[PDB]
From Swiss-Prot:
InterPro entries: Serotransferrin_mammal (IPR030685), Transferrin (IPR016357), Transferrin-like_dom (IPR001156), Transferrin_Fe_BS (IPR018195). This is Serotransferrin. The modification Dimethylated arginine is found at residue 20. Glycans are attached at residues 29, 410, 469, 608. The gene is TF. The lineage of its organism: Eukaryota, Metazoa, Chordata, Craniata, Vertebrata. Its main location: secreted. It comes from Homo sapiens (Human). Transferrins are iron binding transport proteins which can bind two Fe(3+) ions in association with the binding of an anion, usually bicarbonate. It is responsible for the transport of iron from sites of absorption and heme degradation to those of storage and utilization. Serum transferrin may also have a further role in stimulating cell proliferation. (Microbial infection) Serves as an iron source for Neisseria species, which capture the protein and extract its iron for their own use. Hydrogencarbonate 1 binds at residues 117, 121, 123-124. Changing residue 649 to E: In allele TF*B2. Fe(3+) 1 binds at residues 60, 92, 185, 246. GO terms for biological process: antibacterial humoral response; cellular response to iron ion; intracellular iron ion homeostasis; iron ion transport; multicellular organismal-level iron ion homeostasis; osteoclast differentiation; positive regulation of proteasomal ubiquitin-dependent protein catabolic process; positive regulation of receptor-mediated endocytosis.
Length: 676
C-alpha cells in the first residue's frame, strides 16, 4: 500500500520526504502511503519503475515516450492540469503561426523563413523539425545543417551560428537569452510580427499573450497538417502536435495505477491548490518544480485504455520518431501507399486476405481483437481503413477519425455520386389518444423493436435521456416490451412470448422487430419505435397475418420532436433521427488515398461483377457481412459530409452521445480526455 515515488535530485527527495510525513498524518492506516526512492536521473527513475524498484514518476512528454519504449513499457496514469476543473488544460498545442494570406501551406515551407523559440525546445524546434524531417535535404545530420539548407533564412536561438549561419539570418548571433529580441515565445512571435520570418513555431497560447486585441490577431492564421489554414482561434483543429504538459507513468502491467491515483487524489485534496498552508504539493521550498510543476492546479485520472502512443498522439510520436529513427522512405512522392485494412474476425481476416492478393497488393490486412482495437490502430497508424456502424463512426469521430465513403444499399445507376443518409427513426402512436405528445411520455406503455436496436431503443432513449437524466430507463415507462431486457423488468411485461421466448429478442417473441413492435402498438401499446416504412407495409392489407389484416394507415400518427403529431407519410418532417449507413472510416491524412483505392477496387470486385464463384467480389461474405455489409452495392463519396458531426445527424449524435453516458466505452472515455 506504499507507492514508491521516484526523486531525481536531493531537493526532490526532501520534498518527497515531507510529502511522506504530511500524508502520514492526515491518512488513516487504511489509506495510501508514500515511499521515497532516490535515483540520479529521469532515465534511472524509468528503469527503476520498470524493474519494480519504484512505482511512479512524473515526466515531460519527451520522457513519457522514452518510458513507453521497450523494455520499460510504462504508461500515463495521472495528469497535471493548469487551470480549473472546467478548464484543466493538461495539454498544450505546438502550432505554426503565419501572416494572413501569406499564401503557402505546411508542404510549402521549403525556402521560407522561420522563427523558432529556441533550438532543442519541443514546441519551437523538436516538434516542427521532427515533422519536417523527410523534406530536409541530404545529409540531414547534423540537423542544424539540414534545416539551414531547408529554410532560406531563420532565427534559431542557441543554434551554432559560426558553423551554420543561415539559422542566425533573422537574429544574428542567435542569442540564447532575452538579449535576443527574437528569443523565447514572445521573441519567436515578434520575429514574425516584424515580418522578418514567414512562420513562427510557438504555442497556441503564445499569440494570445502578445496581442491582447482581437483586431490584430485576425491578420494571423495557423498552418494545419492537412495543408489548410484556420483562424488563430481554432488551434485545437489546426496544431502540429498536442503535448501532455506533465504526466505520471507506471508499469503497463501491475503498475498500481489505482494506488497512485488514490494517493494523489487525497494529496491534492489535503495539500492541493491552497487547500493547506502547512505543506504545498505544488510548492517547492528548496527549489522550483519539485516532484511536480508548481504550475499544477491539480490532478486528473488518465482513462485505463490509454497507452503512451495514444496519449501523446500520432503527430507527436511522428516528430520524435523521425528525430530519433531518422528513416525516410524513397517510395514515389505522388503514388499512394498500400492501405492496411482492419479485420476483427478470423473470417474477416480470411476475406481480407483474398481481397489483398486480388488487389495486387494495393490492399493489405491487419488483425485486431476488438472494433475499438481496430479504431486504435487507425488512430496510431497501425492500420488505415475499416467500416463502422453509425455508433462506431461516432466513437471513431470523437477520436479524430473521419467518414470518407458510405455503404449504399439501394441499387442506383450513379450511386457512387449520391450518399443515402439511411432510413428514418420514428415514434408511432394511435391517432385516438390525442393527449399523447412527446412530453407526456412519462409513465406510458411502450413498444421497442428490441434493446440495442437502432430505431427501437437507441434514438428514443438517447433523446429521452434529458427527460430522465439517469440510467434507469425502465423507470420512465410504467410498462413496455423491450426484447432483451431483464426478464423481471417492466420492459418485459408486455411481451407475449410463450415459455423461454417470453422476452427474448428473436422471432418467437412475436412482439420483436419492426413488425412486432407495431403489433405491440396496435394491440396493447401506447407508443412504438419503428422506422418510417413500418406503418405502410404493415397496414392497408399488405400484411395477411391475423392481427394485421384490417389495420389502416389513417389510424396511426407518428409523434414529432417539437411536441406536434404528424401523418405517416410526413416522416420526412416528423422524425427522431436519420439512422445512418455504415461508413468507411480513416485518418485525416490517408483520406485522399483511401478515396482513390477503394473506388478503383469496387470497380473490379464491386456489385457490378457476376460469376462471383469464378472471380472475387468484395461484397459477398463466406459467412455474414465480412468487412462490408452484404447489402452494399457501391461506396459513395462523402464530399461535404466528411466529418462525424456532418455524416451523423446532430440528432443522432445527441442520442448516441447521451446513451454513451450510461454505456461506457474505454476508448471513448480516452479520446474525450484528450479532446473534451
Ligand atoms: N503484463
Ligand atoms: N501485457
Ligand atoms: N398478443
Ligand atoms: N397476437
Ligand atoms: Pt499485461
Ligand atoms: Pt399474441
Amino acid at each position: 500500500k506504499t507507492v514508491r515515488w521516484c526523486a531525481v535530485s536531493e531537493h526532490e527527495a526532501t520534498k518527497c520526504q515531507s510529502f511522506r510525513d504530511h500524508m502520514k498524518s492526515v491518512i488513516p492506516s487504511d489509506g495510501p502511503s508514500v515511499a521515497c526512492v532516490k535515483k540520479a536521473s529521469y532515465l534511472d527513475c524509468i528503469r527503476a519503475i520498470a524493474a519494480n524498484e519504484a512505482d511512479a514518476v512524473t515526466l515531460d512528454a519527451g520522457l513519457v515516450y522514452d518510458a513507453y519504449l521497450a523494455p520499460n513499457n510504462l504508461k500515463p496514469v495521472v495528469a497535471e492540469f493548469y487551470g480549473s476543473k472546467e478548464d484543466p488544460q493538461t495539454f498544450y498545442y505546438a502550432v505554426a503561426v503565419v501572416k494572413k494570406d501569406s499564401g503557402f501551406q505546411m508542404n510549402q515551407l521549403r525556402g521560407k523563413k522561420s522563427c523558432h523559440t529556441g533550438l532543442g525546445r519541443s514546441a519551437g524546434w523538436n516538434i516542427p523539425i521532427g515533422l519536417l524531417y523527410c523534406d530536409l535535404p541530404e545529409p540531414r545530420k547534423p540537423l542544424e545543417k539540414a534545416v539551414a539548407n531547408f529554410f532560406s533564412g531563420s532565427c534559431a536561438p542557441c543554434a551554432d551560428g559560426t558553423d551554420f549561419p543561415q539559422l542566425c539570418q533573422l537574429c544574428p548571433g542567435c542569442g540564447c537569452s532575452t538579449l535576443n529580441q527574437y528569443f523565447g515565445y514572445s521573441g519567436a512571435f515578434k520575429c514574425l510580427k516584424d515580418g522578418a520570418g514567414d512562420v513562427a513555431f510557438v504555442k497556441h497560447s503564445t499569440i494570445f499573450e502578445n496581442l491582447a486585441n482581437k483586431a490584430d490577431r485576425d491578420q494571423y492564421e495557423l498552418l494545419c497538417l492537412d495543408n489548410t489554414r484556420k483562424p488563430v482561434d481554432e488551434y485545437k483543429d489546426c496544431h502540429l502536435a498536442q503535448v501532455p504538459s506533465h504526466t505520471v507513468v507506471a508499469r503497463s502491467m501491475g503498475g498500481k495505477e489505482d494506488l497512485i491515483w488514490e494517493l494523489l487524489n487525497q494529496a491534492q485534496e489535503h495539500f492541493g491548490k491552497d487547500k493547506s498552508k502547512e505543506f504545498q504539493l505544488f510548492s517547492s521550498p528548496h527549489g522550483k518544480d519539485l516532484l511536480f510543476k508548481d504550475s499544477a492546479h491539480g490532478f486528473l485520472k488518465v482513462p485505463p485504455r490509454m497507452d503512451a502512443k495514444m496519449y501523446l498522439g500520432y503527430e507527436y510520436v511522428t516528430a520524435i520518431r523521425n528525430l530519433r529513427e531518422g528513416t525516410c522512405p524513397e517510395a514515389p512522392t505522388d503514388e499512394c501507399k498500400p492501405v492496411k485494412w482492419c479485420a476483427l474476425s478470423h473470417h474477416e481476416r480470411l476475406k481480407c486476405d483474398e481481397w489483398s492478393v486480388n488487389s495486387v497488393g494495393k490492399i493489405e490486412c491487419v488483425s485486431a481483437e476488438t472494433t475499438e482495437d481496430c479504431i486504435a490502430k487507425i488512430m496510431n497508424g497501425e492500420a488505415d481503413a475499416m467500416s463502422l456502424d453509425g455508433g462506431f463512426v461516432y466513437i471513431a469521430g470523437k477520436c479524430g477519425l473521419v467518414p470518407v465513403l458510405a455503404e449504399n444499399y439501394n441499387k442506383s445507376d450513379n450511386c457512387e455520386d449520391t450518399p443515402e443518409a439511411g432510413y428514418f427513426a420514428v415514434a408511432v402512436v394511435k391517432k385516438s389518444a390525442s393527449d399523447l405528445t412527446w412530453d407526456n411520455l412519462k409513465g406510458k406503455k411502450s413498444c421497442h423493436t428490441a434493446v440495442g436496436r437502432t430505431a427501437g431503443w437507441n434514438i428514443p432513449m438517447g433523446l429521452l435521456y434529458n427527460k430522465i437524466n439517469h440510467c434507469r430507463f425502465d423507470e420512465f415507462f410504467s410498462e413496455g416490451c423491450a426484447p432483451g431486457s431483464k426478464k423481471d423488468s417492466s420492459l418485459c411485461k408486455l411481451c407475449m412470448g410463450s415459455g423461454l421466448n417470453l422476452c427474448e429478442p428473436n422471432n418467437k417473441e412475436g412482439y420483436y422487430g419492426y413488425t412486432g413492435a407495431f403489433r405491440c402498438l396496435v394491440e396493447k401499446g401506447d407508443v412504438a419505435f419503428v422506422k418510417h416504412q413500418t406503418v405502410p407495409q404493415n397496414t392497408g392489407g399488405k400484411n395477411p397475418d391475423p392481427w394485421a389484416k384490417n389495420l389502416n394507415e389513417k389510424d396511426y400518427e407518428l409523434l414529432c420532436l417539437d411536441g406536434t403529431r404528424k401523418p405517416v407519410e410526413e416522416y420526412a418532417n416528423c422524425h427522431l433521427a436519420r439512422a445512418p449507413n455504415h461508413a468507411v472510416v480513416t485518418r485525416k491524412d490517408k483520406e485522399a488515398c483511401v478515396h482513390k483505392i477503394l473506388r478503383q477496387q469496387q470497380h473490379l470486385f464491386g456489385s457490378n461483377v457476376t460469376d462471383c464463384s469464378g472471380n472475387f467480389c468484395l461484397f459477398r461474405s463466406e459467412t455474414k457481412d465480412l468487412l462490408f455489409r452484404d447489402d452494399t452495392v457501391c461506396l459513395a463519396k462523402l464530399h461535404d459530409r466528411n466529418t462525424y458531426e456532418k455524416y451523423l445527424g446532430e440528432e443522432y449524435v445527441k442520442a448516441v452521445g447521451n446513451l454513451r453516458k450510461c454505456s461506457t466505452s474505454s476508448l471513448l472515455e480516452a479520446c474525450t480526455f484528450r479532446r473534451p
